[PDB]
Design a protein around this nucleic acid. Sequence first.
RNA 1: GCCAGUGGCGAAGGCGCCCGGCUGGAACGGGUCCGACGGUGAGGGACGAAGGCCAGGGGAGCGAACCGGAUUAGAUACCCGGGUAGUCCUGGCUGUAAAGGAUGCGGGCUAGGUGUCGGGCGAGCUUCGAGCUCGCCCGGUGCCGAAGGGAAGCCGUUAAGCCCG
Lengths: 151, 184, 37, 63, 133
Amino acid sequence: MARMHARKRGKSGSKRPPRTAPPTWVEYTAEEVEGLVVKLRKEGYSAAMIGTILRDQYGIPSVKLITGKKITKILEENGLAPQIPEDLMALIRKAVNLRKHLEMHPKDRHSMRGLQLTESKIRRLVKYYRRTGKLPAKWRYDPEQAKLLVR
Amino acid sequence: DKWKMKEWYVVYAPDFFGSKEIGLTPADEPEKVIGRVIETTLRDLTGDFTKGQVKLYFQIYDVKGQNAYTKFKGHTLARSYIRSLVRRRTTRIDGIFNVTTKDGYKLRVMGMVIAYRRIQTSQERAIREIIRDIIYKKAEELNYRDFVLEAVSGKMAAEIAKEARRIYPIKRAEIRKIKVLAEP
Amino acid sequence: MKRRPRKWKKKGRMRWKWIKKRIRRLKKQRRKERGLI
Amino acid sequence: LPKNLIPMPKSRFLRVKCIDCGNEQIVFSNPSTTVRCLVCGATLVEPTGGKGILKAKVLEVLE
Amino acid sequence: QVNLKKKEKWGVAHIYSSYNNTIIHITDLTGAETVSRWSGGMVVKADRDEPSPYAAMIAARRAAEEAMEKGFTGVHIKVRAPGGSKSKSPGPGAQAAIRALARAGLRIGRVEDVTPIPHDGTRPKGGRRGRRV
RNA sequence: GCCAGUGGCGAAGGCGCCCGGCUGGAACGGGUCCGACGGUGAGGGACGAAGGCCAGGGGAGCGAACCGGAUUAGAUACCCGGGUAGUCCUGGCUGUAAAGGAUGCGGGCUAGGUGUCGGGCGAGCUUCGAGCUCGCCCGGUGCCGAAGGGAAGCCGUUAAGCCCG
Ligand SMILES: [Mg+2]
Ligand SMILES: [Mg+2]
Ligand SMILES: [Zn+2]
């Protein structure tokens, strides 16, 4: 899914099997699963990393299957969900680090293009999240404000 | 200048090669043969034809009288041998390293290995690291003399073929060149 | 310029590079006698 | 009907026990993180580009 | 006058061979004292004939007999086609000259194509399209 | 340089000595997260070979212009000898190319075979090697090819086929 700026037909990904009900081999209930989610967010892990750890260590496939809820739903219930969304945050951190690189390296135009594409993605997601309310309407990407944000 | 005022100034190799006569140069005013250089194909120790391709360059140092004694300047492998080595569907991994021996001789060592097949750049640089590590430790633990002897021999190349067979199988590693830079 | 591969062919033509160069010389003369002389 | 209809995982969840504590623990065969025993901190599977390399499963199951 | 038991005096014949001339040049084992240097253009008067294996053998014979007069029972061979941006093939004069030396009777030792090959390349002549002759 | 390839990376232009540092993007694996956020894009912007220009440096080789030697009926050329700008660096402008896959981008369908690069899986072998061989999956890059298409050449699951934009 290099699509969107590279147009390679990559198919790497997950293959969730159709599951109307949770697996019987699973030990944990919805409640303790939620507790683990909250524990790991306090340990400082993003939701993606939380699902990864619960898949690899605790053998939990699809917190959604188990609890009926999503990880970010659990986080916002326990008052721990991130202020701005994670994917946007990640892009912004990338862009800031790259801004720094490019100030010390002005002739790296290929990395400059990578920055341009990164900020394009940012703008797209900002548009969508303004439209859906996950950001204020007046929110807008800016490099310096984003630097303060990350920091 | 006529050629009859010339005296033949027999030329001897260094000590650690066995101070054999490696030839004789004509000259007058023996200051004229100081910087001169002789190349020989390890016919110093020609009890082996395994090494007819190893050209050793010595340089006259301190002629005494009708006896010109030399120093080791470097060695190279013969272009014939190298062009036999480097083929297609075959990989060439060279490494050029500056090393100070235990006794302060500075050398540039251009070693090389030949992997059987077309391999990855990461493997190539792993082997380059192997070469670097072997050469560096040999240099810091050995002196100029036995180092050079190893290298004009093949103990080092053999260690390198071994200790790099673990990255990829190897076909006839070598050391390919040494040149001296300094001799404190 | 806008160019034409058709013009680049040579079946009944002069070479396009040189046609082009002629055109540009003419244009230069015209520009020259237009603005200042 | 085969191999693209209902694309199904090749990976498996599998039950292992550590050699040190012996606690049975479910894990994933293709982990992105080094999996540690919940009791001892021992690595049960070390991550790779694909199927993780398994330590400490001498009594094993797979679901 | 060192007491020479062997009379196996060895020199070096540097043979510059090209498509326009050939130069035999015999020296001591070092290469810093010259003993014979003969060219196609010495041995003939036609420029077009300078490169030929004919007149290469003659230059080789004269240089050989001069050297084996002066001692020098044997010669190593270093044949040299022109430089890096120029041609890298010697010519016929090379093999012709070594055959001539063997005929003259000098013990031919080890031979080597000592041709300077570049690992980079300066720009060669002719321009982008070469010699359109 | 040889290695160096219907090889690889890159939007294209383009990118080859090694080492270290900063950095971009992709593939694979993924019961990870978000939850349609997507496509195309008028206008608009960025990048953009060589060459050229401004300024400042450098200048080995090559070398437009020019200068000489030949050739020729002539020779404002081809050949030879030299040679200025330029080619290199710094910062800017220029914004053109047979910039070509002469093939806009996305998505679905329509036999495959055989290579090769990368990742993965499974087997076997091993000098137990980031190793070798076989097969399978994904993604790239090629050749061939039935049907099909086409004026034909040729294309042919990397369509120049059918459909959706
Ligand atoms: Mg057309
Ligand atoms: Mg065909
Ligand atoms: Zn344990």
